Design a protein around this ligand. Structure first.
Ligand SMILES: Nc1ncnc2c1ncn2[C@@H]1O[C@H](COP(=O)(O)OP(=O)(O)OP(=O)(O)O)[C@@H](O)[C@H]1O
Ligand SMILES: Nc1ncnc2c1ncn2[C@@H]1O[C@H](COP(=O)(O)OP(=O)(O)OP(=O)(O)O)[C@@H](O)[C@H]1O
Lengths: 309, 309
């Protein structure tokens, strides 16, 4: 018959299409349920039973369908400190129900705090050394009171856990740093400060299963936050230097099937790794369909090794 | 020539007394810094250096010694949903600094959500079967809205993540349950419902390193919350059944050096496991100086294992 795959992602990608005609376990076909965290909810019981109910509006047709997934593919961020971005309660629920998934719910839960992820990168840094793993120097402030300890300017300050540029400020001098700290005191959260790199371009090394791919990204808007606004994106060739980067990061939290390393290439010719992203990394470049193909394969491969008749 | 040990615990226990004279790595002495989470703060850097502050009411109204721990022993809860009980930011910081500790900062971070820990127990339950691992049945509500899925009464509803009775309520019918849910809508969090078991006494099976102890508590106060007022506590004899319980739970999140299974023993002569505690379990009974000794040994053992000259 068919197995139920829940894909948590936005409408602009048609995962039901991507898994069209594909088979698993020889005869079992694949039923895709797609929706975003904001549209999902569920209930789970210690005895193995659970039920997810999607709520979406398709063609003026407000849907309230219910179902029981046998596997999850997650493509969104489970946490964010802006309003209505908090979906940890759901990832917890899906682990409570024991759902198999990509990436593992374990890793997704742990990726809900950037500094916690960065701490894993710091450990890889201690293990590989700078030449091979050039981690940007960063300072972690559990809250605003420790920000009396001043970093070398200029720095980029990144407040809490947020996405697409949110909570990130370039800070050029001491007075302006005291001002930002006084604001961090109102967000009542943690913050980081790392050197502002004068950059030629962005670098993103990705890993989907066993497929590697490197991209570069130059701005055309005058903004240092090279995302949003607008920027010329082109693919570059994979080197082993790059491969070692995403390979080492992909081992954390028991293993990430899908992840990417973010780095800035400075005018001084040096790379600075500043973040690792997991299964919620957006697909980019002119090879997206390609990547979705790779992911599809991944989900099938994992469903076969983990599911039962 | 000494290694600094930070112990996170209340002022009535005197950890500097337990480590007096003890040596690590042959000839290094141990310098103990003790304080509660509410009095600590720190800053850590990717390059590997960090620094901790301890603000205690001494020599005046506020004095602040500073120091650099080489190991941490944590005895308090790191998270709590009542006011001024969130210290997840300090645990992330200690991990960012790469601090070795007991229990591991990894397991401490994952113990900040009861339902997430319980999801581990559900898996242990699925592996072992109910006769050997009698896990209480429980239902997980991501939020108050799924609470239209009524359970079988009477149940104990446990709201959010709290301790020592906080946020737990007995509910006997579906009207009272609709009122508790509407409250869960004000706390804006997750909640669980499990059957209310009429009990003879509580059971706690603890594990410190390789030492096991079982204790029982019978209430003389009245209401079901046995942890209230006066209660008959005593060490009783270990058994294979009990040992298997805490040994299977001690495996989660990479391993717990210090943990405890809590269960209620029903009038129907049965055992109901309802929670697992970690290194923040309070020391109880009359063998506390004994246990403080076992723990002390543990910390010396781990320091010799993980530290360097
Ligand atoms: N230390 C830095 N020096 C220079 N540029 C930086 C630095 N940190 C970030 N940037 C620039 O800002 C952009 C966005 O920052 P970052 O990726 O950290 O934020 P984000 O919210 O995670 O973004 P998204 O959610 O879109 O991935 C980067 O792609 C990069 O061009
Ligand atoms: N399902 C249940 N049915 C009946 N009694 C229960 C149930 N779950 C918990 N209890 C009882 O409720 C009391 C409070 O539980 P909880 O686990 O929160 O406290 P505790 O850690 O034992 O208390 P303390 O911190 O005082 O030692 C305990 O005595 C426990 O046995």
């Amino acid at each position: 018959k068919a197995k139920v795959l829940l894909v948590v992602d936005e409408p602009h990608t048609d995962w039901a299409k991507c898994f069209r005609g594909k088979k698993i376990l020889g005869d079992y076909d694949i039923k895709v349920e797609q929706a975003e965290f904001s549209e999902l909810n569920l209930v789970a019981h210690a005895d193995g039973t659970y039920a997810v109910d999607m709520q979406v509006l398709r063609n003026g047709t407000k849907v309230v369908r219910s179902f029981r997934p046998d596997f999850v593919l997650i493509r969104q961020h489970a946490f964010g400190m802006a309003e209505n971005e908090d979906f940890r309660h759901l990832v917890i629920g899906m682990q409570y129900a024991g759902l198999p998934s990509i990436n593992s719910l374990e890793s997704i839960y742990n990726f809900c705090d950037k500094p916690w992820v960065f701490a894993q990168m710091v450990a890889i840094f201690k293990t590989l050394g700078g030449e091979k793993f050039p981690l940007i120097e960063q300072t972690y402030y559990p809250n605003h009171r420790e920000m009396l300890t001043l970093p070398t300017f200029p720095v980029v300050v990144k407040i809490g856990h947020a996405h697409s540029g949110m909570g990130k400020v370039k800070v050029e001098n001491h007075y302006d740093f005291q001002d930002i700290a006084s604001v961090v005191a109102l967000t009542q959260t943690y913050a980081t400060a790392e050197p502002f790199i004068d950059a030629k371009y962005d670098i993103r090394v990705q890993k989907i299963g066993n497929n590697y791919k490197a991209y570069m990204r130059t701005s055309i808007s005058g903004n240092w936050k090279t995302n949003t606004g607008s920027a010329m994106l082109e693919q570059i060739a994979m080197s082993d230097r790059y491969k070692l980067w995403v390979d080492a990061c992909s081992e954390m939290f028991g293993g990430l099937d899908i992840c990417a390393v973010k780095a800035v290439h400075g005018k001084d010719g040096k790379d600075y790794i500043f973040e690792v992203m997991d299964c919620s990394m957006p697909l980019i470049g002119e090879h997206q369909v390609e990547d979705r193909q790779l992911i599809t394969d991944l989900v099938i491969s994992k469903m076969n090794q983990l599911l039962s008749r």
